[PDB]
Symmetry: C5
Subunit: 146 residues, 5 copies
């Protein structure tokens, strides 16, 4: 994957968990021969699609990282609807994979469990970067050459 | 920071005290960041915000959307929140412009009060949404064309 | 006052009595604001509104959507309300024209009656939507080009 | 209303219920004096929008007929979501009424009761055709003419 | 006789054994209808299907979408299914190409196995989706311009 132009946009709402996701994505990127992907920080998940849209203009793949955790109101449902709709539209408008590393949990421990910390069951940042890179390589192979 | 950003704020009026409080928070953040004169526009309800947001996005770096939807006796709340979600999301991507989320969507009036940055509120979504708008605008300025 | 704005109203007919009442509300607000002859068009059910509202938006500053969707025995209500929600939101932004929300989405007949501005009704969604349509039309006029 | 150009697309999943919807639609078009409508069969509700899109290029109105009955899984919800987004989009892209004749029920009993059979409470194939026809005529009047 | 139709199949790999069974059902229908060599592409998860389906749609009469989403401990399952639903629906209509539904969306693994055309499965979702794809391609063929 050393030739792929990779972008990562990570939100900052719930800082420790977001850093963990990013750390996972970067390590997968580096392990695949990419030492310097484009990394951009935004505040919350609502801000990801617009930044992903900009990044997709000149990258083969964008990894979307963030953490939405349910509060006391229906607001959680609408934040996740907005991000779902936006990323989906961005990937199709740009014909570019936007990988899903945006945790959507009922609880904080569930998010921690999926963030790739030493005792976590899995790592979404890593998983989303693999998805982005595999899908970019597939698309490159399907498209025009040579 | 933030003094060159062209900010717009669109605020509904459906629950007066709450709406005015969100708008105050948005405006105080803008002033704190060197923005004394953002474009401020008022609409009746949340459903009116997207079309007005769309107009504003043509000549601003960021738009803050403020409103309050509180659940009543019917499914109506669900559809109002869906319309706004789809609309703001479409607007931000059609215009490549941050549309910051300061629209409260609550089960109770208590909860909305608690999130509007009134004296005894736990938090202020109006202030938070303005931080998001300004920061994303600045990020986009950095990402886009300059030499 | 809105004596210069071009208003259209599209009202469905499924549940006639409540629909006529919504229309009455809409027309009264219109007349009170200086508009005695808005464009009024009738459609069968709520699913017909967006396509007609689309046509009306090409020739008006605001469209008021009126209708009544009352829950039955099946999930069907959800998908009818979903469709109207997506459509009207699309139409408003495609045409950059306010499409005002006067479409009741209720669990019972009692609830729709209570929101249709009949004599003993708690409120009048037709009136409310119409105020939203005109105030938004006027706001947009002030925002857009004039010399 | 004898001058409107009418197309009907019906899915075949739950065949007995689908035919009764179609018969209801056919009776209303015949009673309103139409030149026999363009009638197309598709397998399930999921296929309706893409065929509706084709028919909409050559017709004043499309009647969409189908039956979705909830099963053991959440699949029902997503099937109904797809058809909702699709037809809505098709009607607005083409500026053409796409009438609602898609039953979305919990049980087979409920579908039967809405399919215009002798002991049925309602006739949705009929209801949808009236809506299509009336909306076609309304748009014809709103649009440009002498 | 579908020997003339250009068929693509995109299948995810999340839950490998089940995806493979779905693919096998698809292939068998395809081969039974005269198509020994359809375009087959593997993607990681269901989120990746729309963008690849879009690419396939430029060069094919029909695309079959195969995949498996099984609900976990969080609301994540709902959003993943919302994304796939919206994406595929958008792709079929942008490109006017049948995109057949072979994406399982189940609460349990047991449910998904039962729908995947295994020896003891109640039904075969892969086979079903392919019949839908091919049949819809043929219909569109007769509906469109020919002599
Ligand atoms: O990126 C993000 N993440 C999260 Cl967790 C939230 C808040 C989730 C909503 C919880 O708040 P409550 O519903 O007001 O208690 C957000 O807005 N944006
Ligand atoms: O900006 C807004 N805010 C709110 Cl709270 C509503 C009504 C919420 C619906 C509650 O009332 P009920 O469902 O009729 O009891 C709106 O339409 N537009
Ligand atoms: O404008 C409208 N209004 C209403 Cl109330 C309906 C019926 C929705 C409820 C259906 O009843 P069920 O068939 O028992 O679910 C509609 O289709 N179109
Ligand atoms: O036109 C249609 N109709 C119906 Cl009823 C279905 C399946 C309903 C899904 C129920 O099955 P289960 O959820 O697997 O038990 C479809 O796909 N397409
Ligand atoms: O193609 C797919 N399939 C599936 Cl099953 C998933 C997992 C959805 C369930 C996630 O588990 P949770 O994190 O425990 O909610 C996916 O992301 N992509
Ligand atoms: K790109
Ligand atoms: K929680
Ligand atoms: K990690
Ligand atoms: K702008
Ligand atoms: K309440
Ligand atoms: K405040
Ligand atoms: K730059
Ligand atoms: K207009
Ligand atoms: K009822
Ligand atoms: K009234
Ligand atoms: K102006
Ligand atoms: K047409
Ligand atoms: K059932
Ligand atoms: K005319
Ligand atoms: K094609
Ligand atoms: K499970």
């Amino acid at each position: 994957a050393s030739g792929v132009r990779l972008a990562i946009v990570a939100s900052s709402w719930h800082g420790k968990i977001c850093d963990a996701l990013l750390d996972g994505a970067r390590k997968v990127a580096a392990g695949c021969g990419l030492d310097d992907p484009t990394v951009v920080r935004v505040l919350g998940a609502i801000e990801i699609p617009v930044v992903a849209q900009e990044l997709a203009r000149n990258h083969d793949a964008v990894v979307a990282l963030g953490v939405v955790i349910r509060g006391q109101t229906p607001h959680f449902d609408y934040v996740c609807d907005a991000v779902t709709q936006g990323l989906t539209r961005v990937s199709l408008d740009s014909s570019t994979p936007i990988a899903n590393g945006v945790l959507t949990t009922n609880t904080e421990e569930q998010a921690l469990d999926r963030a790739g910390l030493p005792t976590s069951a899995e790592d979404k940042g890593a998983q989303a970067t693999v998805a982005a890179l595999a899908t970019a390589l597939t698309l490159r192979e399907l498209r025009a050459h040579s």
